[PDB]
Design an enzyme around this catalytic site. Structure first.
Site, PDB file in Angstrom:
ATOM      1  N   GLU A 175       2.207  -9.423  15.070  1.00  0.00           N
ATOM      2  CA  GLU A 175       1.432  -9.954  16.205  1.00  0.00           C
ATOM      3  C   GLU A 175       1.628 -11.468  16.379  1.00  0.00           C
ATOM      4  OE1 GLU A 175      -2.707  -9.162  15.737  1.00  0.00           O
ATOM      5  OE2 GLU A 175      -3.224  -9.835  17.769  1.00  0.00           O
TER       6      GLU A 175
ATOM      7  N   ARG B 269       0.850  -1.161   0.000  1.00  0.00           N
ATOM      8  CA  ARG B 269       0.000   0.000   0.000  1.00  0.00           C
ATOM      9  C   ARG B 269       0.874   1.193   0.000  1.00  0.00           C
ATOM     10  NH1 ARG B 269      -3.068  -3.079   3.093  1.00  0.00           N
ATOM     11  NH2 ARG B 269      -2.549  -1.869   4.946  1.00  0.00           N
TER      12      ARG B 269
HETATM   13 CL   LIG Z   1       0.080  -3.507   1.950  1.00  0.00          CL
END
Ligand SMILES: [Cl-]
Ligand SMILES: Nc1ncnc2[nH]cnc12
Ligand SMILES: Nc1ncnc2[nH]cnc12
Ligand SMILES: [Cl-]
Ligand code: NA
Ligand code: NA
Lengths: 183, 183
Positions: free
Chosen positions: B103, B66
């Protein structure tokens, strides 16, 4: 001659070749050298944007991740929305999916169902046309959502890999900036 | 009032929130709705590039995926090379690697050794600052190759997740267009 012919030549030259990668015999065409050449990268976006300026495209779709690098700047140049097609599980809203074949298995691409709708005229952009697997799958995503797609655009075409032939034979007019021989 | 303050408003409003995704209690800020709003997307790039216009940056780095959607149009605006940082095995030339915590385990990011040289001045661009882990890794890659990096830019900051403070201790000045409360 024209600003376009000089730019096409500089583009092809800016793309470096890596011999015997990823296997012996393959001449790899490395688009990352074009990304770090600002004149070549800007040129590429310019030519792609100009080619579709009168096409009436309403959206641009690029697949993760090198499709993003060329699709998103063309969208921005055309002033139209950009719609990512992604590997599975990354997109947060409702999606549909399509499968495609890899050398060693199969994988899937997803698009947001709310992001394409009847009426839309969609240009698909990617870095490199090889077997055309992922574009075939993208085309399906778009058409299921009522989108019209008849154009796909690429920085590099490898016609010997058959992608062009098979997309052509499916309604898709392929346009590619440069082309190379080999696999 | 200024072109700047009205664009920020617009950009913040273009970003959809999705409740209880990816689980209960989280309000997800979905940057994909900004990508498909051509005014918002274009304004976001314009603001990031204008902010660094006098920074003397020579390279823009963005992490897959992104990331690419915001670093590469920024690189194109600034007329400087774009350098991707990728998940392992995608980049074809010589690389170095940095591992970082997720995580539920660990992952790694790679960069081309040839794409950063001592004396480069590098801007890192990402969509959203949460914990800051991938950015800290990205910074270490750039510095191991001689690159200077003292700036990182984001569309969205989530200050509650501690990313900005973490990066500040690594000598990075964070700029973010908009901010949201919540984890
Ligand atoms: Cl991404
Ligand atoms: N020669 C080549 N260069 C870059 N990508 C490819 N994918 C398949 N063949 C390729
Ligand atoms: N609320 C949120 N929205 C988007 N990305 C995130 N990453 C961590 N928290 C987030
Ligand atoms: Cl990719
Ligand atoms: Na739809
Ligand atoms: Na180097």
């Amino acid at each position: 001659a024209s600003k376009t012919a000089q730019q096409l030549k500089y583009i092809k030259d800016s793309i470096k070749t890596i011999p015997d990668y990823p296997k012996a015999g393959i001449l790899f065409r490395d688009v990352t050298s074009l990304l770090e050449n600002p004149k070549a990268y800007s040129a590429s976006i310019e030519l792609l944007s100009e080619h579709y300026s009168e096409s009436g495209v309403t959206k641009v779709v690029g697949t993760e991740a090198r499709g993003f690098l060329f699709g998103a700047p063309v969208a921005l140049a055309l002033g139209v929305g950009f719609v990512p097609v992604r590997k599975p599980g990354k997109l947060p809203r409702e999606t549909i999916s399509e499968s495609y074949e890899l050398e060693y298995g199969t994988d899937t691409l997803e698009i947001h169902t709310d992001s394409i709708q009847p009426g839309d005229k969609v240009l698909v952009v990617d870095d490199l046309l090889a077997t055309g697997g992922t574009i075939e799958a993208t085309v399906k995503l778009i058409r299921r959502l009522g989108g019209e797609v008849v154009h796909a655009a690429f920085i590099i075409n490898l016609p010997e890999l058959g992608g062009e032939a098979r997309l052509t034979q499916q309604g898709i007019h392929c346009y590619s900036l440069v082309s190379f021989d080999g696999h």
